[PDB]
Structures are given as C-alpha cells and as structure tokens.
Coordinates of C-alpha atoms in Angstrom, one line a residue:
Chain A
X1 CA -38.7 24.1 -2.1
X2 CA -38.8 22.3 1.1
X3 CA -38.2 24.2 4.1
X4 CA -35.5 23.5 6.8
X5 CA -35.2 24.2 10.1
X6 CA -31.6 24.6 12.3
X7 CA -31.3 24.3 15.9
X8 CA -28.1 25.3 17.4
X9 CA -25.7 28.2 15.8
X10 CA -22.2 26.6 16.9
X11 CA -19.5 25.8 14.3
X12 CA -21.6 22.7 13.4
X13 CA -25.1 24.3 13.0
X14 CA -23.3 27.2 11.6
X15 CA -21.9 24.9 8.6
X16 CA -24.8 22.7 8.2
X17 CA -26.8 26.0 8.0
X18 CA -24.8 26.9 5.2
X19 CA -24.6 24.5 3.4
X20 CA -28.8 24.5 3.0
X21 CA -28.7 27.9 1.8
X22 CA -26.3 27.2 -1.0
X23 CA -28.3 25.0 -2.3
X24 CA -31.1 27.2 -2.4
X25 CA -33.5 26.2 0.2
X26 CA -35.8 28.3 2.7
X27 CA -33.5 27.8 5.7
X28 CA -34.7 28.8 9.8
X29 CA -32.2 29.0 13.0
X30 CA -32.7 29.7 16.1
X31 CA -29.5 30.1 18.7
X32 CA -30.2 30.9 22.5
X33 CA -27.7 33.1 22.4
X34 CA -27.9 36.5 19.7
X35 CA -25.6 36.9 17.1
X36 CA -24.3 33.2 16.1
X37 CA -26.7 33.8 12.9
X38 CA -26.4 37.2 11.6
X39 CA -24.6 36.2 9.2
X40 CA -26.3 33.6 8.0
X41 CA -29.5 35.7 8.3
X42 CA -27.7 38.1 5.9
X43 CA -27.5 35.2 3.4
X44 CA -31.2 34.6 3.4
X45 CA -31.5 32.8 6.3
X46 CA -35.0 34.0 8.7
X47 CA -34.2 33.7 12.5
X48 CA -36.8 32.5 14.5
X49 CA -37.8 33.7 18.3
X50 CA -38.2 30.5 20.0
X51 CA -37.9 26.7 18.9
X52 CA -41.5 26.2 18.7
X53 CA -41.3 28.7 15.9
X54 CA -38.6 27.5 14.6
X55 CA -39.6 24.0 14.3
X56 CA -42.9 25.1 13.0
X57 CA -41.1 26.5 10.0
X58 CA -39.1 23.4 8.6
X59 CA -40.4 19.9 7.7
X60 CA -36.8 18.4 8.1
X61 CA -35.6 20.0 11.8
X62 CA -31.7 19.6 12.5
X63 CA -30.9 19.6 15.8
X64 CA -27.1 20.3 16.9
X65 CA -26.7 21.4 20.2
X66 CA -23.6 19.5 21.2
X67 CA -24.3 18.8 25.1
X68 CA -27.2 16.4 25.8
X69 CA -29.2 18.3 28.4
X70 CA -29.6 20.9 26.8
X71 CA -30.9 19.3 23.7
X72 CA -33.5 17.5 25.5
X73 CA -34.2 20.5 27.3
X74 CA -35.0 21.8 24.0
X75 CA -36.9 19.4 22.2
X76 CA -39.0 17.7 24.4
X77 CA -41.3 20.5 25.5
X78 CA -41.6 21.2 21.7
X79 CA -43.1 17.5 20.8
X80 CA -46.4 18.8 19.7
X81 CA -44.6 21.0 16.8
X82 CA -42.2 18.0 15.9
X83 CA -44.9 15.5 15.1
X84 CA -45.3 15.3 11.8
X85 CA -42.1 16.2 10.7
X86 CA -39.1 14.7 10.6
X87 CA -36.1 15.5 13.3
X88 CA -32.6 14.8 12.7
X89 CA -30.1 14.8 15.6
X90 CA -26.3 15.4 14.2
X91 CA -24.1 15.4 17.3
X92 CA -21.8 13.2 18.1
X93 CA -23.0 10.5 20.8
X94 CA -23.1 7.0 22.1
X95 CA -25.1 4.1 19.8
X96 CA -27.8 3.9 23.3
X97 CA -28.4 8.0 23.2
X98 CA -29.5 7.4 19.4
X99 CA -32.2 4.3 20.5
X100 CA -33.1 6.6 24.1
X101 CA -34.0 9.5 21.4
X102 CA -35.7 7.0 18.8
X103 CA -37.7 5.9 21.7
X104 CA -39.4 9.1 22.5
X105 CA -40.1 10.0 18.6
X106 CA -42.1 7.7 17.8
X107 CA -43.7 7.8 20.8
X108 CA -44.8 11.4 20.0
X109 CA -45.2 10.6 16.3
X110 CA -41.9 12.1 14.9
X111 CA -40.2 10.6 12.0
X112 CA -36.1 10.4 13.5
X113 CA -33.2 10.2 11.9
X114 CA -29.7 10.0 13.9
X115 CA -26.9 11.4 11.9
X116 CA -23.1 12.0 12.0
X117 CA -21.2 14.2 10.5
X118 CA -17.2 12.2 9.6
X119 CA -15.6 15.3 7.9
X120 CA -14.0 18.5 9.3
X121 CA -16.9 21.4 9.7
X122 CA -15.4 23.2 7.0
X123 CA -16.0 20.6 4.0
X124 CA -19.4 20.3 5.1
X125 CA -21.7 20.7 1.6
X126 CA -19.2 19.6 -0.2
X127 CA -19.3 16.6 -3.1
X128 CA -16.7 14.8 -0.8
X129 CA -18.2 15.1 2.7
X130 CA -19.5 11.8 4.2
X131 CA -22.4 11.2 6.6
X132 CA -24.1 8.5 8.2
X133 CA -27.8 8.5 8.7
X134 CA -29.9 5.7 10.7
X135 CA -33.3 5.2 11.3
X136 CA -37.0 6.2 9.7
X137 CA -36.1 4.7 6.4
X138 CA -39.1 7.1 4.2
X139 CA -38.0 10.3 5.7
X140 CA -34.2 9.9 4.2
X141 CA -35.6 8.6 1.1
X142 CA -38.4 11.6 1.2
X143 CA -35.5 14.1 1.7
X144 CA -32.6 12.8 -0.1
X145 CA -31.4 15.7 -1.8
X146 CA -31.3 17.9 1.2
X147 CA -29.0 15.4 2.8
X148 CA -26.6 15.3 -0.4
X149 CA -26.5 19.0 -0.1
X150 CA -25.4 18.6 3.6
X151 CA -23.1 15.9 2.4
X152 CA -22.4 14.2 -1.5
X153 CA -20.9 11.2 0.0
X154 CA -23.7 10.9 2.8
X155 CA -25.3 7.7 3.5
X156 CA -28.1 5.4 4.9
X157 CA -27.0 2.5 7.0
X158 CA -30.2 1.1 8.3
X159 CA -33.1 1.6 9.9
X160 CA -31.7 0.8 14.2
X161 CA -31.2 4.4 14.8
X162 CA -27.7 3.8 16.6
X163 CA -26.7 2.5 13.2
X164 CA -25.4 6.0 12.6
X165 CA -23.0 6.1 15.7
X166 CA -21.9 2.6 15.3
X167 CA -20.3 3.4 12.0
X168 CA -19.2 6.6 13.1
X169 CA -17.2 5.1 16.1
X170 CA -15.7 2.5 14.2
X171 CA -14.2 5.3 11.9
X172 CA -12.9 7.8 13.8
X173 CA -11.3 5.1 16.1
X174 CA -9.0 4.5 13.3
X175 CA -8.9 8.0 12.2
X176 CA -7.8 9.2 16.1
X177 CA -5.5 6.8 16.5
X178 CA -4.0 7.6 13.1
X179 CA -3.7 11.2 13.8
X180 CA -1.7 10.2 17.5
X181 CA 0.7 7.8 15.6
X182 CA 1.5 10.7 12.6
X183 CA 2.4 13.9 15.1
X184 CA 4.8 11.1 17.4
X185 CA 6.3 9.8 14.2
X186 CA 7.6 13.3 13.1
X187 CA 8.4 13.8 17.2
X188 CA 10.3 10.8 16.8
X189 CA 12.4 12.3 13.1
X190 CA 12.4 15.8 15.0
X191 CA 14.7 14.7 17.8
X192 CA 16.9 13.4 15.1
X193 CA 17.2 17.3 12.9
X194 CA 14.4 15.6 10.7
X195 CA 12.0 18.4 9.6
X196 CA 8.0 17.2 9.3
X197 CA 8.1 17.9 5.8
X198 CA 11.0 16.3 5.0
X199 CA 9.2 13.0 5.6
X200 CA 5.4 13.8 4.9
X201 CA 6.2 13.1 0.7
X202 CA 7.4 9.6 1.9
X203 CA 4.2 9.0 4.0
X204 CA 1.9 9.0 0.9
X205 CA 3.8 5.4 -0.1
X206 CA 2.2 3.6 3.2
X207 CA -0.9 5.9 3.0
X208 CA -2.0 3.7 -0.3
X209 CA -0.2 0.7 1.7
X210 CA -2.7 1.9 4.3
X211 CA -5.4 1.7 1.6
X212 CA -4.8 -2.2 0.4
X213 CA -4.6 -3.1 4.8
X214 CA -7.9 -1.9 5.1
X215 CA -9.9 -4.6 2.8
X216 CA -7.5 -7.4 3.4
X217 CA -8.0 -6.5 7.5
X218 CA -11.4 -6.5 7.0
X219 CA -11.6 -9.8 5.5
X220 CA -9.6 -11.6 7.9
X221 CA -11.8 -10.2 10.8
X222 CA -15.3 -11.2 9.4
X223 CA -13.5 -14.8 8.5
X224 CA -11.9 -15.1 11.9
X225 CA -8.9 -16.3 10.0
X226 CA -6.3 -14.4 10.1
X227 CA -3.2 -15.9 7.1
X228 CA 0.0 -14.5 8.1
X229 CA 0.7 -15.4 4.3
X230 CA 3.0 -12.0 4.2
X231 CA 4.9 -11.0 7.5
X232 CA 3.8 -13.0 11.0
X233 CA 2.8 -11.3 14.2
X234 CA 5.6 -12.2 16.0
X235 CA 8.1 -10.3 13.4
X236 CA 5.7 -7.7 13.8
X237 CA 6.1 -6.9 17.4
X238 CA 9.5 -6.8 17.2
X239 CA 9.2 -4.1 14.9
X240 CA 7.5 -2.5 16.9
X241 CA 9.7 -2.6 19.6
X242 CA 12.4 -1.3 17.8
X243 CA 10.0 2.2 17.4
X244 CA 9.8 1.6 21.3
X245 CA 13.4 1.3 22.1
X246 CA 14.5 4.5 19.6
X247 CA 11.3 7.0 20.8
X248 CA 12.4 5.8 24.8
X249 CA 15.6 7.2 24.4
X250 CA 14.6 9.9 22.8
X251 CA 12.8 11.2 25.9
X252 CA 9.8 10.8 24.2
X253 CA 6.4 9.2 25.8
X254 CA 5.3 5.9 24.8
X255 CA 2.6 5.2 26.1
X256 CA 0.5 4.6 23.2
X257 CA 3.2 2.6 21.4
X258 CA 3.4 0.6 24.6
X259 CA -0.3 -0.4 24.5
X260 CA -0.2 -1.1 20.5
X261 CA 3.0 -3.5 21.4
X262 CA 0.8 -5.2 24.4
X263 CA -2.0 -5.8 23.0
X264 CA -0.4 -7.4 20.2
X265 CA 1.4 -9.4 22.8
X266 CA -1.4 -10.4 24.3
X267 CA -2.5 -12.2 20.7
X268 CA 1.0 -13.3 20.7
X269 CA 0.8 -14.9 24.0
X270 CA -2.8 -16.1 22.6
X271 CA -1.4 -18.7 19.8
X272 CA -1.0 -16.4 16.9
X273 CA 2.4 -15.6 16.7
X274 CA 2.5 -17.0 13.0
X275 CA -0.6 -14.7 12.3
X276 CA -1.2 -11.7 10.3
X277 CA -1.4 -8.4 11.7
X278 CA -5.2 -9.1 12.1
X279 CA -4.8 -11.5 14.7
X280 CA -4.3 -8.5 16.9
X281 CA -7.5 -8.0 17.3
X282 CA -8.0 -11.1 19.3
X283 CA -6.0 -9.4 22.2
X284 CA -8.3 -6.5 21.9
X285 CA -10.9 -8.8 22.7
X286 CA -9.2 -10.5 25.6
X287 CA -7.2 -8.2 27.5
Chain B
X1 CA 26.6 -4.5 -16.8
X2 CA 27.7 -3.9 -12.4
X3 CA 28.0 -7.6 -11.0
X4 CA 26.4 -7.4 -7.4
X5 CA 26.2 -10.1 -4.1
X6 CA 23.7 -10.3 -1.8
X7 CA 24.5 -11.6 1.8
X8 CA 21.5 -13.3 3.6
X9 CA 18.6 -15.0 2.2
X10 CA 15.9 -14.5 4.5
X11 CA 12.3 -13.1 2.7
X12 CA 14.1 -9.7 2.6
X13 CA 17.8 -10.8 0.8
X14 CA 15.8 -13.5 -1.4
X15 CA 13.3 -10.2 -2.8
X16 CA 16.5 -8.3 -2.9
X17 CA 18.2 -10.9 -5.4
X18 CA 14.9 -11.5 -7.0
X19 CA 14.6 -7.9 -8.0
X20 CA 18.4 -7.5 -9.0
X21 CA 17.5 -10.3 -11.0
X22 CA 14.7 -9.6 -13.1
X23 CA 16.4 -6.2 -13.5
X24 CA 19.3 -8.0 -15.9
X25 CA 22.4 -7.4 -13.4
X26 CA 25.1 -10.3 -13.1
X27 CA 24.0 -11.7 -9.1
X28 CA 25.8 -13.8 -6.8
X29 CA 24.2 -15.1 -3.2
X30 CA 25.4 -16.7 -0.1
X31 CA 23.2 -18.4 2.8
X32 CA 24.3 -19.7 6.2
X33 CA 21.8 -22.1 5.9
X34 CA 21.6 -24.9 2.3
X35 CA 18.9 -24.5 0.3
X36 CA 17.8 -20.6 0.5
X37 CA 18.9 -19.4 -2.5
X38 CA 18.0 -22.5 -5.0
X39 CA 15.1 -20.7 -6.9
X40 CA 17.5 -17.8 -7.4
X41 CA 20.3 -20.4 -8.5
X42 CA 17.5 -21.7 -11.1
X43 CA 16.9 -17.9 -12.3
X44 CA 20.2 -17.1 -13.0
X45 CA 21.8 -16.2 -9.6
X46 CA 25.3 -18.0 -8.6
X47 CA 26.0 -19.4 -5.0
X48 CA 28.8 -18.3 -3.6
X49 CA 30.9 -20.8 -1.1
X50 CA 32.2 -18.5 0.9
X51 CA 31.4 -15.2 2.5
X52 CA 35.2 -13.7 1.2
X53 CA 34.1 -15.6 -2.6
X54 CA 30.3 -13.8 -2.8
X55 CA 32.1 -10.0 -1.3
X56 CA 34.5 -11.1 -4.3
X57 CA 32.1 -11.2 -7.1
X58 CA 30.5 -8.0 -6.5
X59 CA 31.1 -4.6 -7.2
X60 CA 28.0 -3.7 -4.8
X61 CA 27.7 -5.6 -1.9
X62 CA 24.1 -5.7 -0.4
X63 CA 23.5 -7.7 3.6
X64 CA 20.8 -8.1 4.6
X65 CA 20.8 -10.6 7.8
X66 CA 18.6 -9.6 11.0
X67 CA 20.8 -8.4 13.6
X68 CA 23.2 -6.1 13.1
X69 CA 26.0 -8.2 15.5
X70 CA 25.1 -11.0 12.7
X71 CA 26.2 -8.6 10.1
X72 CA 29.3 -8.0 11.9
X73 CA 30.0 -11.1 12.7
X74 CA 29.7 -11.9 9.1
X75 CA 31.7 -8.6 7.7
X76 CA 34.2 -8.1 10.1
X77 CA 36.5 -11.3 8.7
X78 CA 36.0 -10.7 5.1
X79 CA 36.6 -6.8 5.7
X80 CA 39.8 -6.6 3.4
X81 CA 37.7 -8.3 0.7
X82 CA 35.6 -5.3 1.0
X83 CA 37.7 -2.5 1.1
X84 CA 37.5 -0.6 -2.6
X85 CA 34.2 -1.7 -2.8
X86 CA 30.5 -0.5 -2.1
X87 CA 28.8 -2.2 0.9
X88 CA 24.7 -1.8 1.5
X89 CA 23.8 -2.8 4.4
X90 CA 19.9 -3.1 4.2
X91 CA 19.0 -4.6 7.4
X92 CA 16.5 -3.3 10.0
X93 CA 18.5 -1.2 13.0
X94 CA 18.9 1.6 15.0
X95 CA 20.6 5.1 13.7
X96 CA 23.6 4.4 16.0
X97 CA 24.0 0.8 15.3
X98 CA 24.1 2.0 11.8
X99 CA 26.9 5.4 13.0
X100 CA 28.9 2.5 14.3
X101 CA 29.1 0.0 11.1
X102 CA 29.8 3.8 9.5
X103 CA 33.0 4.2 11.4
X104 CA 34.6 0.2 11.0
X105 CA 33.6 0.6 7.3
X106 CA 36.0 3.9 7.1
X107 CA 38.7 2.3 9.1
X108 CA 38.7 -0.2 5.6
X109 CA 37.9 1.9 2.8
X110 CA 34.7 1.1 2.0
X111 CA 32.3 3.4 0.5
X112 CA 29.0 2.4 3.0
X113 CA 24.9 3.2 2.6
X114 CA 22.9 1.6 5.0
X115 CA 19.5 1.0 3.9
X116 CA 15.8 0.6 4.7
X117 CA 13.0 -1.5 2.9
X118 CA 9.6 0.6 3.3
X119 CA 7.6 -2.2 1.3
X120 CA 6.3 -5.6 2.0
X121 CA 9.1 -8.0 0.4
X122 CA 6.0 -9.1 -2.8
X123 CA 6.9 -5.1 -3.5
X124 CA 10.2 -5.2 -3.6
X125 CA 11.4 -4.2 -7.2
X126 CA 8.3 -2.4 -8.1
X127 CA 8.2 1.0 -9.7
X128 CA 6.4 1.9 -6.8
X129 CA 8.3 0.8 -3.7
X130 CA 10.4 3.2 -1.3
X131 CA 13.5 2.3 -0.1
X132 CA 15.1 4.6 2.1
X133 CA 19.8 5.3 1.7
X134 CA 21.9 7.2 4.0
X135 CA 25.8 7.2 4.0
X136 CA 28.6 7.6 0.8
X137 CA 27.0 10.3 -1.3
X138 CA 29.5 9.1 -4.5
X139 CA 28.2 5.3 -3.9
X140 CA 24.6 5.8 -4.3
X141 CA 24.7 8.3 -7.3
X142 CA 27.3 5.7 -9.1
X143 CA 24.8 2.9 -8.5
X144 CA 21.7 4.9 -9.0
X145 CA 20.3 2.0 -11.5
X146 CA 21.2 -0.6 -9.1
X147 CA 18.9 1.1 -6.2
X148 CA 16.0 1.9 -8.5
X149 CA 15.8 -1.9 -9.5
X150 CA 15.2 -2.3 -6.0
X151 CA 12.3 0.4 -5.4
X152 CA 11.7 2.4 -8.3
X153 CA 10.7 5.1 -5.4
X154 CA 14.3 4.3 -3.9
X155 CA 15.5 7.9 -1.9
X156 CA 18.7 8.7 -0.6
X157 CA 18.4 10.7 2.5
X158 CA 21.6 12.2 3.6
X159 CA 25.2 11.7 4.5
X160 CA 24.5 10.7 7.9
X161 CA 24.2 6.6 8.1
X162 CA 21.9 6.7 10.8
X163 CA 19.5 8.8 8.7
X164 CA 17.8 5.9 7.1
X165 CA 16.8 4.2 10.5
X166 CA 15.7 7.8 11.2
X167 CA 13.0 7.7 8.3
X168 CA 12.0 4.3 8.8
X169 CA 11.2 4.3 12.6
X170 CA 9.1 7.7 11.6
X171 CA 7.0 5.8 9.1
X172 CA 6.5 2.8 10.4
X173 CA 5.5 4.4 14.3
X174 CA 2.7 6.4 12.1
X175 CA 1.5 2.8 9.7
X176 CA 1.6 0.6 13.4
X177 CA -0.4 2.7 15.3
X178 CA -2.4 2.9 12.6
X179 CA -3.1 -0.7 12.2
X180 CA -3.5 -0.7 15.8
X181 CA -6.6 1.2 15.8
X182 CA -7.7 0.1 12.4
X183 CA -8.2 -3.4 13.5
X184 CA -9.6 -1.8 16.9
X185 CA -12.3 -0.2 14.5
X186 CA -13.3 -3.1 13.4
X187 CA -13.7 -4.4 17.0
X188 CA -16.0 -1.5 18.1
X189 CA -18.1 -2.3 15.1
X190 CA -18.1 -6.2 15.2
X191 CA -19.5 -6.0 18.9
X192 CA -22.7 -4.3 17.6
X193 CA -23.2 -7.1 14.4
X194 CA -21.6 -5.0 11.6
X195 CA -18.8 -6.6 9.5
X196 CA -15.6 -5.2 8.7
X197 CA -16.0 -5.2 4.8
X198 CA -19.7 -3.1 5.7
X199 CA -17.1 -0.2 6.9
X200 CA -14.2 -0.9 4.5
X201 CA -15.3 0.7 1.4
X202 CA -16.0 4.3 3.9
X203 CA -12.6 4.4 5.2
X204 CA -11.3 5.7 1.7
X205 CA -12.9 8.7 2.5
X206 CA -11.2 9.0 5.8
X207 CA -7.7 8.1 4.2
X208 CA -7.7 11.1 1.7
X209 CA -8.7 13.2 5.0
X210 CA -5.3 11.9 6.7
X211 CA -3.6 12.6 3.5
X212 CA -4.5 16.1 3.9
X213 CA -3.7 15.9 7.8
X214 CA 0.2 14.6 6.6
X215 CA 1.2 17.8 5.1
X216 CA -1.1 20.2 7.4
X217 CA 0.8 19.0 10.7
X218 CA 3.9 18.8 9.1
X219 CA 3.8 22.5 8.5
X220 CA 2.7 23.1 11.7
X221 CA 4.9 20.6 13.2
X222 CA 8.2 22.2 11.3
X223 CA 6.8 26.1 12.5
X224 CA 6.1 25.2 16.3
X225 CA 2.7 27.3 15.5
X226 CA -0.5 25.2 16.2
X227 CA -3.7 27.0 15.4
X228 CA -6.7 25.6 15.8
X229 CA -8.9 27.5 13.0
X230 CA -11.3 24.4 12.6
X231 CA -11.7 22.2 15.8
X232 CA -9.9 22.6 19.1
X233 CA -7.7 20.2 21.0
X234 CA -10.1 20.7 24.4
X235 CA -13.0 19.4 21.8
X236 CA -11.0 17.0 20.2
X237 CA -10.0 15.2 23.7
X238 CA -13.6 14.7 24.7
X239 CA -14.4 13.5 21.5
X240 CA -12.1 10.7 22.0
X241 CA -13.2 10.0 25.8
X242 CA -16.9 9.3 23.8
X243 CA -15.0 6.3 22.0
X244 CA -12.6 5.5 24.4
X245 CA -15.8 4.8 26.9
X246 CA -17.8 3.4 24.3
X247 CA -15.2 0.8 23.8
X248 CA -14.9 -0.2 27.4
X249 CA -18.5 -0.5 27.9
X250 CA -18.3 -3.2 25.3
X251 CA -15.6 -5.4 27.1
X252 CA -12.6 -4.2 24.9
X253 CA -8.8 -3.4 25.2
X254 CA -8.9 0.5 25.7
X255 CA -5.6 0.7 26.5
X256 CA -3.8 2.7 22.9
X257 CA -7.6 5.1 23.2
X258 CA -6.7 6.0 27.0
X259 CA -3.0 6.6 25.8
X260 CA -4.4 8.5 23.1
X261 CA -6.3 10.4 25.4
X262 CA -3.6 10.9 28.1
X263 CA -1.5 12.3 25.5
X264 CA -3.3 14.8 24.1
X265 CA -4.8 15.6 27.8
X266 CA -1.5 16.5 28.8
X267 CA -0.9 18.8 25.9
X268 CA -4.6 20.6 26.9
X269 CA -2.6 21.1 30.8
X270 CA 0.0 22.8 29.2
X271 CA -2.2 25.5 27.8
X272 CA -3.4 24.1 24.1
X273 CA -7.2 23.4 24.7
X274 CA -8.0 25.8 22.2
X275 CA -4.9 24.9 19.1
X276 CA -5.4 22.1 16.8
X277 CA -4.2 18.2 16.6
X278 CA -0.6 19.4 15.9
X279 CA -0.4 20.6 19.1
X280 CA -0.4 16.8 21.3
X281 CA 3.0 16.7 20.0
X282 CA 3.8 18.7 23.2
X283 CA 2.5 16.4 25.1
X284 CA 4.7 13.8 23.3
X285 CA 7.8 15.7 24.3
X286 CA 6.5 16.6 28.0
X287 CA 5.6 13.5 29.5

C-alpha cells in the first residue's frame, strides 16, 4: 500500500528498487541520467521527471546517491516536498555526515532515518541481508515492513542518527581486514604449489574458531580485562612472526602483517605480555 | 593396542598425551623439566627416565618441544633408538626446517610426518579439531587411529614434509589478521560509547558472508581471473579510506587499515580498479 520513492539508479538504488517491488509496493525513481531504470520501470516501477516529483510520490524517500555533493544538491532545494515524510539516506558515510543531515531535517520538519546497507548489493531483499537504521524512532516503527523487505535481518540501533554508521564501521573494519588477511594467506600457500582450494575446506575449522573469538573478545574489551587464561600475547606475536619470516622470503609484501605484529607489540611493550589476544587493543589505543 | 611416547610437555605435548590418553592407547612421556607430566602419570601415562627409554617404549614417537634446534638437540643422540620406528614431529616451524629434519630422519630409517596443531590445546582430541600431516605416506595411513585421537578432523597433506608448515602459516596469516581488526572493530565502536557485546551478536551475519568469500576467492584465486560482477576494487579502496580516516580522526592505530589500503591501492595501479577483492592479491605479489 504505502508508496516509496527511490533517488539514485546506481547498483545500490538499482537493488534497493528491487527489492520494493518484489514485495509488492507502488515504487518511484528518478536517475539524472536516462536509462538506469528501464528496467525497473518495466517491472512496475513509474519514473518520475524531477525529484520534486518524485519525492511527492512516496511517504518513505530513499536517497542513494553515493557522492555527498550531489546528494545535497539534490535534496535540499526539495525540503518543502520532504516535510512530512520520512527520508532515509543509505550511503555509506562518516558518523558526523549522519548528525550534519539530521540537523537540517528536523529543521525543515522531515522525519530522518540514516541507514546502511552491510551485505553485497546482490542479497539485498533477501531474509538474510542486514541493515542498520538510526534515528526518528516512529518512522522505522511506522514502516517496519518496508525495511524487512529491503532487509530480513535489518535493524534499529537508536535514535543518534550516526548510530547507523557507527555500527557499520565497526563491522566492516573486521570484515576488510578479514578479506586482506584470506587472499595473502592463499598468496602465501600459492608460492609454495598450494592451490586456494586446496585450503579453503580447512578454513571453515577457524571460521567457527572465528565465531567463539568474537563474544569472548567482546567481553574482555567492555571489562577491560583481558585473561590470557588460553595462549598469552607474547606466544602470540611470535606466531605471528613466523607468518612474517615465511611470506618475507616469499617475496611477498607485508605490510599489513607488519602492522598486526606492531601493534601487538606495542601492547606487549605496554605490560600485557601474559594477556589474551584482547589486550591488543590497548596498542591500538596508544600508538 | 600401538604403545606411543610423547617428547615435551609444554601445553601442546601435555594435550597431546591427554588426548592419546583418553583415547585408550598405552602412553609414555618425558620432560626436561620435574613435574610436567604428573597429572598424566596419575591418569595412566608412564614417565620415561631417559630420552633413548621413552623413544623405546613407543611404536609412534610424537615431539613436540618449541624450537626445532631443541628437537634436534633432543633427537639427534637417541637417533638409532629411532630408526624402525615412526617419528611425529608436531612442533611449530618453517617448511624447510621441517625439509631438513626430513633428510637426517632418512639418513636413519625412520618413517617421519611432521605435524601442525590448528586448535587451541582445550581442543585438542575433539571430534572436531584439525591437525594438519605431511611426510611418510605408509606412517600416517598405519596410524590413522592414533592421529584421529588427536583431531578427529586430523588431514594428511602430502608427501612433502614442509607441506604442513605450508597449511598452517596459510590459516593462521588469514585468523591473525583477522583478530587484528576484530579487536580494532571494537575500538572504532568503543570510542563512540557502544560496547563490544552490542556488536557481537551482528558479526554472525558477517562470518557466513566470509564463508562465502573463502571459496569465491579461492576459485578466483586458483584461475588468475578476477571479475568484479558485484563491487569493484576502485570502490572497494575508497570504501576503506572512509574507515581508515574515521579511525584516525578518533586517535587510533591505523596502521593494518593504511596497509590494507596500500595494498589493494597498488593492485588498482596495476590496472584492476574495475575486478573484484580477489584481485589485491596482485598487489600482494607486486610490492
């Protein structure tokens, strides 16, 4: 029933777009540039002329142009339409851009929410697909199952706008550095004849191990004691070292491997050489 | 029922003994240093004086000191002792340190696996933990039982002895540098008042995402073909440069993100700005 309104035909607007028509509601897009929507357009969807139209056709208004200019560009000289409905931003920012654009909102008398999209564009509408929304608490309640459609797994997490960005930065920190570590682990077994998918069936045992580290790190780090009851820190540098010494002589760089080893130094050199792995975050802390 | 000695009694060696233990087999242990091995002497296990009287009570011998010099030191005068026999040497290396111990071990006629424990030593035993052969094909399929007692997810990996480093440095590069930005994840977050466990329970989702990343940049890793159908490295790098400044802004160590970063930006100079993740590994190999 309730109608939606897309601003911005890239891959993002493109999937989110989708996603609102699959579940059956009156969906609106506008791109600047012709031909991003046509076949969304041939799905249902009714392209508009210019944003003021297109804002004047949706209650909930997604906006995903990805540079910031431009989407300010956009939006502010259509304030008048926007009041009264509710605007949600999903591109990917800083936690200060979210409070800058909650600022002028409710300044203008627009319900905001700041979202962020965690999974690949393609799983977008899925059951599975997570999103983080902050901000005008009765608007995401009001619209629930339009944001499930976007995402199953999508949550609230509180009403400061840069709530959204916060949790989404903590994440893909882990995720990015994750990614970095996994292709220069099979660069590492490749300059030894080692295919990739040789090893990838063995990397499922530390991707559960992976799965346990994540509640007993997050533990240690809101006590701000970390146990070492398992391992020590100072074992665990050496470790790493010995993925330093190998991947040198490979020819390989190390850079990153280099900076996980100092930093854990740095907690080393700190007192917490007896310490779990957690203690590593005081050298992130302290560098 | 295959009597077997473990050498060394460290946390590794005493797991080792604990596991052979529980499993039923006939164990005898040795320690440098008094007192390491009385809770296994109380379960069942039998100290051994000598290095040459433990090597003599054992079909399979397993070592499982520190430094591979320490091994030797240790082997090298009991080596006629050892000749007929099967000798596991479980200790963490390099894949030559462990090509060298293959060659002294042939010069005596012993049948030689060296090993890698992929678990914490609490998982040692368990159905589910990975441990990781390479070396006398005829010795581990003999002693299959023996192995699987140790890690019922135990793998042998080859014929060449440096094979099991090769695995294990692979893994454990991808798990640390994990960890690394895990706990940095929880850094970014903790500087604007949310606490770990807040973030914890969303971080499942993002593990099944790298599960799916595992085997998607192995293929692509093992073809040399990199195509970015969703995404784009050039994307993906600024992404990253949004965290990476994020974090700095905040008074954090940056250093693994602007490693991170360098990395992949030196795979986008050499012409991949528009293929996926899998494609930093050039960057990797190009420094």
């Amino acid at each position: 029933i309730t109608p939606v309104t897309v601003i911005g035909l890239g891959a993002m607007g493109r999937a989110l777009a989708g996603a609102l028509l699959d579940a059956g509601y009156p969906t609106t897009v506008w791109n600047r540039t012709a031909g991003r929507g046509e076949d969304l357009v041939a799905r249902g969807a009714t392209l508009a002329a210019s944003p003021a139209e297109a804002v004047r056709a949706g209650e909930v208004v997604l906006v995903c142009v990805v540079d910031y200019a431009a989407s300010q560009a956009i939006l502010e000289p259509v304030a008048a339409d926007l009041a009264g409905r509710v605007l949600v931003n999903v591109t990917s920012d800083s936690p200060e851009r979210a409070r800058e654009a909650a600022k002028w909102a409710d300044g203008h008398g627009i319900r905001y929410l700041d979202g962020a999209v965690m999974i690949p564009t393609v799983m977008v509408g899925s059951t599975d697909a997570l999103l983080f929304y902050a901000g005008d608490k009765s608007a995401y309640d009001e619209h629930e199952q339009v944001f499930t459609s976007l995402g199953g797994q999508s949550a609230y997490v509180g009403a400061d706008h840069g709530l959204a960005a916060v949790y989404e930065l903590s994440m893909i920190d882990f995720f990015w550095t994750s990614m970095s570590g996994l292709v220069h682990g099979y660069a590492l077994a490749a300059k030894d004849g080692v295919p990739a998918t040789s090893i990838a069936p063995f990397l499922k045992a530390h991707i559960s191990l992976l799965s346990l580290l994540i509640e007993v790190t997050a533990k240690d780090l809101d006590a701000g004691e970390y146990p070492g009851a398992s391992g020590n820190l100072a074992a665990e540098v050496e470790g790493i070292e010995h993925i330093l010494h190998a991947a040198e002589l490979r020819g390989l760089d190390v850079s990153v491997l280099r900076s996980v080893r100092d930093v854990a130094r740095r907690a080393v050199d700190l007192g917490h050489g007896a310490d779990s792995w957690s203690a590593t975050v005081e050298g992130a802390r302290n560098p």
